[PDB]
Amino acid sequence: ARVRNLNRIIMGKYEIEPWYFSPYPIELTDEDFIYIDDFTLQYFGSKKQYERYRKKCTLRHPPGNEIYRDDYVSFFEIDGRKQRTWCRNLCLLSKLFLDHKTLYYDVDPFLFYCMTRRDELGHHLVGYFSKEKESADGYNVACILTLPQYQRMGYGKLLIEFSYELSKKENKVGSPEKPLSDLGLLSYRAYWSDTLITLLVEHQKEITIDEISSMTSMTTTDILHTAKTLNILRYYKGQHIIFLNEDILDRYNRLKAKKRRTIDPNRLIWKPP
Ligand SMILES: CC(C)(COP(=O)(O)OP(=O)(O)OC[C@H]1O[C@@H](n2cnc3c(N)ncnc32)[C@H](O)[C@@H]1OP(=O)(O)O)[C@@H](O)C(=O)NCCC(=O)NCCS
Ligand code: NA
Structure with missing residues (x-):
């Protein structure tokens, strides 16, 4: 037996x-x-x-409001309390790829933002990130996941970028819940790095911490840690800034060379509660 x-x-x-x-x-x-x-x-x-x-x-897509839709992906916002069964199923599936996850059954406290890729075949769930409706620590992401069959295709970075667009729309800085898995932390570090690098080339050669957090919703801590890693932290005009150098330009071009898809803030039709 x-x-x-x-x-x-x-x-x-x-x-x-x-x-x-x-x-x-x-x-x-x-x-x-x-x-x-x-x-x-x-x-x-x-x-x-x-x-x-x-x-x-x-229906052939996640049970929620489509608050974002471009030619590449769609994002559905689902209130766990309104779709208990579906969200519980999502959490059970998610736990198969997470070392730890809060009780899968209690989904009421969360909002789930599920990303789908649309083909000639319709919608295909590729990943999601949950978010506490009320986070004492101000975490803008509780759990985040790209389904295994779709990992390493750039979807994770899209999920992260989207979570920050929500924070920006909310006029608040935010950071993912700690502790993060190694996979998760490494993905955020790449995102944070790519973000500061892109800003330095496309916005201004020198940018203050305030300006950065205002444009990205990244917290001071995540910004400083990222800037120190890239060796782009300095003092200019009486305050701390990040600056552009040949290394950053090189990284920017290599990043662009990959012609990766990104999130268009203008397509986020959403108002915070
Ligand atoms: C963390 C997680 C969301 C990252 O998602 P993902 O979809 O794999 O993320 P990305 O694809 O955007 O990551 C970029 C990587 O994909 C690769 N990639 C993306 N598109 C690619 C393409 N078209 N061709 C080749 N490689 C590609 C990048 O080269 C990069 O590799 P690197 O990190 O060694 O530099 C995912 O690993 C996951 O769900 N893990 C399990 C759950 C988990 O631990 N979640 C976080 C909890 S704290
Ligand atoms: Na997480």
């Missing part, structure tokens, strides 16, 4: 192996897989069951 662990999830054409254990309320059997509907995120122990529900009539 085999009592197997969940060793693989079948999502669309993808067969993904979890990185960590997730509390799916499922029976342990001699099989080690479950089906995850790429639209509803519902889990099924049998292909037959999955098929049975797949036929049902359902």
